[PDB]
Amino acid sequence: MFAIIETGGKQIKVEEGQEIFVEKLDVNEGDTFTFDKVLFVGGDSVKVGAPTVEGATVTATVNKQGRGKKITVFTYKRRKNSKRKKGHRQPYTKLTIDKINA
């Protein structure tokens, strides 16, 4: 019913049919991405992957490759005439789950 996948440098709890936001993947819009590294399967029968579950794939369809909300990074030092200002937007990929395998 729920699965744990390790993608990007992070771990995410997922369920059949929900939307997730991860660090950028090399994929185009429309395509189907499949995740390998599955760590936990929370179904009727529970599978624990201490390393991996050995099988255990999660399927998803890519939609909306995108770049995130912008943040201004600002720092200064008091009686010293130094300050720095710069902008950052972080990329992401948006996915919807369809399959949890085991």
């Binding site: 992070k10 995410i12 709890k13 997730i20 936001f21 991860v22």
Partner: protein
């Protein structure tokens, strides 16, 4: 990813009974402070009040160790010049021991407005008798 339970809002608080007979003041105090704080719930958030009610009833069989009774003076000032007052631990336990226990619970809680509220979930009684039977209170045993 933000997959993270925080919204404790709509929690369920329960009611507990601990008895003071033959315990140490500080050790009972710290465990009770933890329960009032809510540190024992898998659902715990510091910005909303989880945690639940604790009833202490014997508050007269409190036990000190060493010479705490004659030492351990308590102090207070009235903001009036030379207005420092005092009382020693043993005679505070002998007259108004409920104050003795609840003071040392409340000194172990945060001093925010949420913390001073969490200290209001505490009821102390000298002697083994209390009025709170409609709340259906459960016995809790000090799991040291």
């Amino acid at each position: 990813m933000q997959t993270f339970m925080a919204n404790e809002s709509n929690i369920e608080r329960k009611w507990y009974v601990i008895d003071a007979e033959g315990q140490t003041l500080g050790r009972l105090s710290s465990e009770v402070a933890s329960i009032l704080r809510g540190k024992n719930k898998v659902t715990y958030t510091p910005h909303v009040d989880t945690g639940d009610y604790v009833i202490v009833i014997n508050a007269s069989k409190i036990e000190f160790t060493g010479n705490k009774e004659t030492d351990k003076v308590y102090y207070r000032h009235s903001n009036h010049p030379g207005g420092i007052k005092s009382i020693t631990a043993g005679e505070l336990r002998r007259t108004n021991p409920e104050r003795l226990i609840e003071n040392s619970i409340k000194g172990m809680l945060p001093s925010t407005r949420l913390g001073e509220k969490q200290g209001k979930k505490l009821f102390v009684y000298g002697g083994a008798e209390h009025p709170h039977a409609a709340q259906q209170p459960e016995n809790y045993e000090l799991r040291g």
